[PDB]
Design a protein around this ligand. Structure first.
Ligand SMILES: [Ca+2]
Ligand SMILES: [Ca+2]
Lengths: 234, 5, 234, 5
């Protein structure tokens, strides 16, 4: 993408979103990042949407194959060869490559050039998310360091967002939702997850009165995700 | 399935 | 795929279907075809499903982008650069590559080694389908020859199926449905399309009484597609 | 949209 203009890459990423071609969208946004300039709010959201749909497809595939593999590893299952394991490993390697790509973009050099609280919290939330995606498939030795990388990114984002953003900010709400999911699914801390979700919901509820109608809609939509997770876990 | 963002 | 076993390629194609990873499924089935052996009914269906989902995604993307392009080419639209046209052309080229791959598989050497009526009609139906997909995006000079390639494949399949298969065979029904769609959308012959659909529906209806319950279900499901197209076009 | 197979 080094020969295409930055504006053209953004425009084509938008076209790809409209056509539901998220691999193309991700490659376009990667080229845009590689142009070296800081991203706007809209461009950050495009990058996140693109890589989120790519990894989402790969993670769903991984879960399907992992469940097939673990049923093939039960008592009474007929030996089928190494095919399921090999294909699960291939999908896993591809997922890991996508996460490594995102984290390399964040490290060179999105995070270190983000001074504003909104952009920095956004990038650290992404970092925590993609280390969490790596942690979902990790099995040995580096597992604990991957988990702590996710925890560290999430924690720094939480600190900055508590200091510099209102409790109704959608980025803060989504960050708290994802950090609670990390606590529940990854860190084996369901009480921390529930506590975080209820505290975030309540403090945003208390400040809903300051918001305009559209900001109100934006914040309540994510508070509903928090309430969904709470209803599932309680 | 639990919600994430 | 030249180093993986044929049985392994089929098994992994099934796993990919379960994981909705249709590009992987297509590559696996291509390797299986490339092994040089004739395909069973189930393997033919796997190949068709894989490449059908791949091209289906690419065709939907193409339609979205083509509609955006033709709205950008109207009176009162602001000039946006060559980005929409370039991206539409890229998606188009990728689609054309997938169709060329399928047709090359059919030509080397699936069709010439298919003696049975069922397998031969299946392969010729595929050939007509993928030339029709090429015709959907063609614009100059080779357009009429592509259209005639589709027509020829469809016609030979129709002749063989009328001679060698009962009117309730699902492959014959699907072939007639697709040939009618060709007449309506590609060959500018809506009366031929309607005639073909109603004739196929009626002759299958007349023979429903010979079928078992499950064959009855299989045939009626595609007759319902014929009735849907008829209701849309009348 | 019309049906195909
Ligand atoms: Ca800066
Ligand atoms: Ca033969």
């Amino acid at each position: 993408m080094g020969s295409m203009e930055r504006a053209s890459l953004i425009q084509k990423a938008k076209l790809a979103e409209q056509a539901e071609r998220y691999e193309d969208m991700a490659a376009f946004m990667k080229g845009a990042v590689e142009k070296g300039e800081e991203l706007s709010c809209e461009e950050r959201n495009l990058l996140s949407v693109a890589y989120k749909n790519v990894v989402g497809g790969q993670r769903a595939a991984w879960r399907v194959l992992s469940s097939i593999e673990q049923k093939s590893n039960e008592e009474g299952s007929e030996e089928k060869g190494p095919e399921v394991r090999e294909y699960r490993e291939k999908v896993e390697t591809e997922l890991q490559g996508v996460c490594d790509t995102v984290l390399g973009l964040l490290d060179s050099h999105l995070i270190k050039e983000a001074g504003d609280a909104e952009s920095r919290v956004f990038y650290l939330k992404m970092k925590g998310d993609y280390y969490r995606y790596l942690a979902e498939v990790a099995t040995g030795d580096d597992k604990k360091r991957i988990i702590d990388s996710a925890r560290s990114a999430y924690q720094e984002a939480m600190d900055i967002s508590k200091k510099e953003m209102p409790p109704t900010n959608p980025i803060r709400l989504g960050l708290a939702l994802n950090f609670s999911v990390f606590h529940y699914e990854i860190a084996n801390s369901p009480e921390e997850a529930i506590s975080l979700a209820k505290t975030t919901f309540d403090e945003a509820m208390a400040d809903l009165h300051t918001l305009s109608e559209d900001s109100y809609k934006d914040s309540t939509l994510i508070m509903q995700l928090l309430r969904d997770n709470l209803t599932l876990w309680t | 399935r639990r919600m994430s963002n």
